[model samples]
Target: ATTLHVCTTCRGTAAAPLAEEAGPRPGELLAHALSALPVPEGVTVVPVECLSACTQGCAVALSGPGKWSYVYGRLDPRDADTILTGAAQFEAAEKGLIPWRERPEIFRKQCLARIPPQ
Candidate 1:
């Protein structure tokens, strides 16, 4: 199975006001929204503490057995569906490398890191 790891503490790209904002951060909102959707089979959305990309947040990471892993940043709750679409593509890839041209536009530009499979 492919794991889609969402950073639940990310506050997104906008500067937070001096006044403390109440409730879940942008990443949490994104996670909840994505979890609510009907995700593709064999893909599981997992809420994680962080991907250590705080400066470029609202980040998510995709990983699977014997497959390349990726981290994507600067995401929003609105991108839930698109993220799932990309995850599906990632899951379907024989070696887990989605073709550049086939990747969703946001995925193409927002990829932060790609780690080799162990």
Candidate 2:
């Protein structure tokens, strides 16, 4: 599976009335948005117990066999589109290495780490 692992407990902000009423532990809301989007090619968003980046806000990792695994940090609900875009680029990469300039601006700044491959 091409999975983007997210931290349900990652800290985030409440940006709207209902969202605030929905009780502002806001990273959970972003989890829903990422998991529910109509992404192509069956890309999935998963809620991991933790993303190992509790020192910051939302975090995610893209990982699959034959693909380079990458983790990102400080994400928010608003960055969903960019994450998906980066995922698309990642999917296209045989070794999951999208060039630096080819990446979304957020991706360049947000990438926290990477692993070789499965």
Candidate 3:
């Protein structure tokens, strides 16, 4: 199964901290957006408090056992559909790597790291 991890505390590019901002954080909104969508089979969405990429905009990580894991940044709530699309691709990838050309534009441009399988 592939897991999509959304950082729920991210403030995006906003200068104001989450405490001062109104309503849910950008990351929270992103999580909610993803949650509202129809997830691909064998894909699970998980909300996390942090991914240690705070300087980057709303961030997420996609991972699965024996598969290459990826961390991506600069996401917006509106990209939920695209994110799931990428996750579905990841889930289907027998080689554990989405070809550079196959990734969504935002994913291709925003990937922060690609981790080897443990």
Candidate 4:
């Protein structure tokens, strides 16, 4: 129950693919999305530099103890609300595993991948 990391590298891209024409900066969209959630007390929304997943611009990752970390891609400003909703679900899960069957389509399909805790 801490912070989620949003990739900021695409924030500067001009009309980036997923950002689409004149869409909000990736960071701005991400912030707006996180702001809508009733984030657990003490949880934070952290903006990060290049997540190194350049091909998957407009992406975000959620990481915390005992939970599988996830990276979602093709995130447009319009999808922020759903993204936040999904993140909220992720935060609530005891295992950090929002079941694949239960995950949003964007997360299930568009999400690049997941990293299990080591």
Candidate 5:
């Protein structure tokens, strides 16, 4: 099981973003893309108002009891599988610390921050 956060307000994906389409916001496209992914049991994806990562482009975070919390950014809507796969890996671990090499490449390169579990 995993909890994922995606910033639905990042405007780094498009020009004249508000004029794009009526389907969904550009920032929200990542979330929409992720919804179509096959999440493992108990995993859930949540879209947030903001990640305070406005300038970091597309962003996402993960957290759970006794697990390390992480914020990753600089992503695109097509990264849904990366996030979902990462979530499966995260839930597969106890403290949420997976092998560094096992993390999604996007996570390795774009992680914005890691917070100690509370």
Candidate 6:
């Protein structure tokens, strides 16, 4: 099954007051990203708590076979499209590496880290 891990503990800092925002939290955004798609067989969305990457609020991770697992940061509810699209591509790739150059800048730039599984 495909897994999408989202950061539950977002810092309520001055820059990104995600914790303060009312409706549609970042987790919802992550959910929205997945919901927008016609999920294929064996694909499932999962929300995780704190990923321990609070420095980068609103982080998400996508993992699957032969696809590079990603930890995307600084995502907002507004970035649902790119996040979902990227997750789709990540799930479909034959190799662990996606065309980094083709990914949305928001995904590329906002991505705080990567952990290529062994």
Find the candidate with the highest TM-score and give its number. 1
**Model 4 per-residue lDDT at 89:** 76
Task: State each model's CA lDDT, in order.
Answer: 0.91, 0.77, 0.91, 0.71, 0.82, 0.66
Question: 1-118, model 1: which lDDT tens digit per residue?
Answer: 8999999999877666764665778899999999999989989999999899998878999999999999999998999999999999999997789888999998889999999998
Model 5 lDDT on a 0 to 1 scale: 0.82
The TM-score obtained by model 5 is: 0.86
Clashes of 1: 0
Q: Model 5: runs farther than 4 Å from truth?
A: 13-24
List runs of model 6 lying over 4 Å from the truth.
Answer: 12-25, 28-42
lDDT by residue (6-115, candidate 3, tens digit) is: 99998777666444646778899999999999999989999999999998869999999999999999899999999999999999997568888998998788999989
RMSD of 1: 1.7
What is the model-wide C-alpha lDDT for candidate 6?
0.66
Alpha-carbon error at 79 in model 4, in Å?
1.5
Off by over 4 Å in 1: 17-23
* Candidate 6 collision pairs: 68-96
Range of the 10 consecutive residues with the lowest summed lDDT in candidate 5: 13-22
Tens digits of lDDT, candidate 6, 1-118: 4577766555422455443556546555566665766665555667676777677767778787655677877677667667766766676666546687977788777877776664
Model 2 poorest 10 in a row by lDDT: 13-22
The sequence of per-residue lDDT tens digits that candidate 2 reaches over residues 46-101 is 78768778755678889888888999887888788788878888887777889999
Candidate 3 — which residues are off by over 4 angstroms? 17-21
Backbone clash count for every predicted candidate, in the order shown:
0, 0, 0, 0, 0, 1
Tens-digit lDDT string for candidate 5 (79-106): 8888888888888877889899888898
Name the lDDT value of residue 10 in candidate 1.
90
Better of 1 and 2 by TM-score: 1
Give the Cα error of residue 82 in candidate 2, in Å.
1.2
